[PDB]
Amino acid sequence: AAPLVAPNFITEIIERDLEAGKYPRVVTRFPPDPSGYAHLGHVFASLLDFNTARQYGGQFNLRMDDTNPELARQEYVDSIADDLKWLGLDWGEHFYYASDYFDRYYAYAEQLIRQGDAYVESVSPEELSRLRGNATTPGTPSPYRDRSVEENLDLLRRMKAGEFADGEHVLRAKIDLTAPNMKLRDPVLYRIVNKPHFRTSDEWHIYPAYDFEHPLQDAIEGVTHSMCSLEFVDNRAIYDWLMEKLNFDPRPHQYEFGRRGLEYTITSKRKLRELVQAGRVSGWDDPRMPTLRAQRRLGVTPEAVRAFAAQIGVSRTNRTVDIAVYENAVRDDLNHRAPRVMAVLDPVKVTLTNLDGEKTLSLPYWPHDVVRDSPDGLVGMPGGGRVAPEEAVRDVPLTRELYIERDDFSPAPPKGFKRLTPGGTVRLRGAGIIRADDFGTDEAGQVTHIRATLLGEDAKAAGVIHWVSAERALPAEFRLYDRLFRVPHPEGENGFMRYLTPDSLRVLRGYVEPSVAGDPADTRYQFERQGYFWRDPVELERVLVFGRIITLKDTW
Numbered sequence: 001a002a003p004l005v006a007p008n009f010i011t012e013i014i015e016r017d018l019e020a021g022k023y024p025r026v027v028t029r030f031p032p033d034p035s036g037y038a039h040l041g042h043v044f045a046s047l048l049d050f051n052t053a054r055q056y057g058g059q060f061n062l063r064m065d066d067t068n069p070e071l072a073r074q075e076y077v078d079s080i081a082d083d084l085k086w087l088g089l090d091w092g093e094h095f096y097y098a099s100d101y102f103d104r105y106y107a108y109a110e111q112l113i114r115q116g117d118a119y120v121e122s123v124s125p126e127e128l129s130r131l132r133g134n135a136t137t138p139g140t141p142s143p144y145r146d147r148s149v150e151e152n153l154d155l156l157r158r159m160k161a162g163e164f165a166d167g168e169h170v171l172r173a174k175i176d177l178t179a180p181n182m183k184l185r186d187p188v189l190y191r192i193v194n195k196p197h198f199r200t201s202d203e204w205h206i207y208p209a210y211d212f213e214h215p216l217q218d219a220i221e222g223v224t225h226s227m228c229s230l231e232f233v234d235n236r237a238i239y240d241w242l243m244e245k246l247n248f249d250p251r252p253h254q255y256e257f258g259r260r261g262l263e264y265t266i267t268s269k270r271k272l273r274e275l276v277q278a279g280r281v282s283g284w285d286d287p288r289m290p291t292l293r294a295q296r297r298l299g300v301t302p303e304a305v306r307a308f309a310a311q312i313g314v315s316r317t318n319r320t321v322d323i324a325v326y327e328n329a330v331r332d333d334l335n336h337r338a339p340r341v342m343a344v345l346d347p348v349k350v351t352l353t354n355l356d357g358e359k360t361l362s363l364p365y366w367p368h369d370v371v372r373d374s375p376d377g378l379v380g381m382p383g384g385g386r387v388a389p390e391e392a393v394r395d396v397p398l399t400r401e402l403y404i405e406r407d408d409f410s411p412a413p414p415k416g417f418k419r420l421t422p423g424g425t426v427r428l429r430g431a432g433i434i435r436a437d438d439f440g441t442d443e444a445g446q447v448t449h450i451r452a453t454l455l456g457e458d459a460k461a462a463g464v465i466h467w468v469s470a471e472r473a474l475p476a477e478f479r480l481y482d483r484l485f486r487v488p489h490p491e492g493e494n495g496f497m498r499y500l501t502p503d504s505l506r507v508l509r510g511y512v513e514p515s516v517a518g519d520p521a522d523t524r525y526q527f528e529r530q531g532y533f534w535r536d537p538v539e540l541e542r543v544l545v546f547g548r549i550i551t552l553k554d555t556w
Helices: 009-019 040-055 074-087 098-114 125-132 149-161 210-221 236-245 269-277 292-298 302-311 323-335 368-372 514-518 537-541
Strands: 027-030 059-064 095-097 118-121 170-173 188-192 206-208 225-229 253-257 260-262 319-321 347-352 359-364 393-398 401-405 425-428 432-441 447-454 474-481 505-512 524-527 531-535 545-550
Touching: 009 040, 009 225, 009 253, 027 040, 027 210, 027 225, 040 059, 040 074, 040 225, 040 260, 040 292, 040 302, 059 074, 059 098, 059 210, 074 292, 074 302, 095 098, 098 118, 098 149, 098 170, 098 188, 098 206, 098 210, 118 149, 149 170, 149 188, 149 206, 170 236, 188 210, 206 210, 210 236, 236 253, 292 537, 292 545, 302 323, 319 323, 323 531, 323 545, 393 514, 474 514, 531 537
Parallel strands: 027 059, 059 095, 225 253, 260 319, 347 447, 474 545
Antiparallel strands: 118 170, 170 188, 188 206, 347 401, 359 393, 425 432, 432 447, 474 505, 524 531, 531 545
C-alpha cells in the first residue's frame, strides 16, 4: 500500500522529531476562516494536514478561526464542517471554535502586559504607521510605549468593555522598532471593533489580530506542526516571539509550504459573489463553481478529490496545477464505479419496419478491462452490492420504435463518416445492423424520423451507436457543464468575466434506458459515448434530471 503522504520536507521534519523524541504524538490542524464556502483551493492544505496526522498516527484538529466578528457566519461553519467531512477528513472530537478561547487570549495578553512585553497604543492609526518606519528608517516609540503595567491593564479592560470607539486604541507587542523584518516592529495584538460576534454576541469589543490568536490557538490546542502558506514566512518571527515570551513547553513550530493554485479556476470570494449576483451561475453550488458543494453536486467523488490532492507535490515554492490532473482523477475514479448505460440526448425517432415483437437483450454493465482490474474479481451492481461479472447485466428492450442520437444520422456525410447515412447501415449496440430505408425532413432541415430495416448475417457496417427504445425509455433532462473559465489564468498570473466560457451550461431533453428506474439515487453512470452522469441530487430533493459529471475525454 503506497504512502498516504509521499516524502516531502515536512514529512522529513516530522520523522526527524519523532526520532529525537521532541514530541510524543504529532498534532496538526486545518484552521479555516468561516467567511465563505470551502472550495477546491482548500483541498490541498486540509488534506496535507489530515493525511500527515494520519500517516504518523497523530491527531488532526479542525478549527474555525472565527476571530473576525464582521466575517464569521454560522452558514460557513455549517458548510465547512459538512464539506470537509464529505471529503474524508476525520477530526473526531477535536473541533474548535477560536472564539471559545477569547478569554484565554485575553489572559495571555494580560500576562504579556505584566511582563512589560505588551502595551496599549493610543496614537492615531496614521501616526502608528508613520512612527513604525520602513526598512530604511527605523521606528520610533510613541509616547505610550512606556506606560506602566497598571495603566495598560486598566485601558485593556475598558477597551474590552467597549468604552472606546474603533481605532481609538490598540494593544501592541513590545518587540523591536528597528528590526529589518517589519512584522517585529510592535505588531498589533488586539483591535477595538464595536460589532457583535455570531457566537459571543456583545461580549467583546476587542478582537485578536491574526498574528496573536493563531499562535496562541496552536499552543492551546497542543498543535506540534503548524502548517501554513509561504505568505506567512515573516509572520513566523512573531509566532516564535510569542511562544517564547509566554514560555510554552512543549511549543508548536510553524512550517510554510508553497501555494498550489488550480488553473482556469477563481476562488476569490468577492469575484465568485459577482458571478452569483449577476446570475452567470445559479448559485454557490452551481456545478461550474469551485466550491466543494458545487463539486459534490456535480457528482465528483470524494475519493477522486483525494487522489488529486495526493498527486500534488509539496515544496516551498508556489506553483499552479492544471485542471487536467483534477479532471483525469475524476474520470479515472468513475471508470470502475459507473456502470455503462444508454441514453440519447438529442433524440431522433427510428422505426424498425421489419421488427414485430419486443426482444429483451441482456447487456453487461461493465467493460472487460474494468472486470479484469477488479480487486476482488467481482464487480458493482447499482443498488445491489458486488457480484460476479456474469451477474452484472440488465434487461435492455429492443422495440420497433427507437431513438438514436441526431448526430449519428447524417444525410450529407463528411468523408470517413462511420455512422448512419441514407441507404447506409450502422450497427446498433448489442443488437445488430440496420439500414436507413427512408427519412423525413422539416422546413428547418432537421430530420424528423427515420425508417429502417434490421438486417441479417451477411450485413456489414462501419460503425456502432447507442440507442434506446422509444416506448420503454424514460424521458430525461440532461445538464452539460463546461469549464466556467476559458483560459488558465482568468485573474492573471499574480473584468475577469471576459473570460467566462460561452455555453458553460447546456440543457438537452432526451431519454434513458428503463433499467435506470430502479437504481439508487446516488448511482453514477457512464452514458455510452456521452460521458459520466448522475441524477442532480438537488433537483431530486425539490417539489428526471441528470447532470453530466464529466466528458469521456479531455476537450481542451
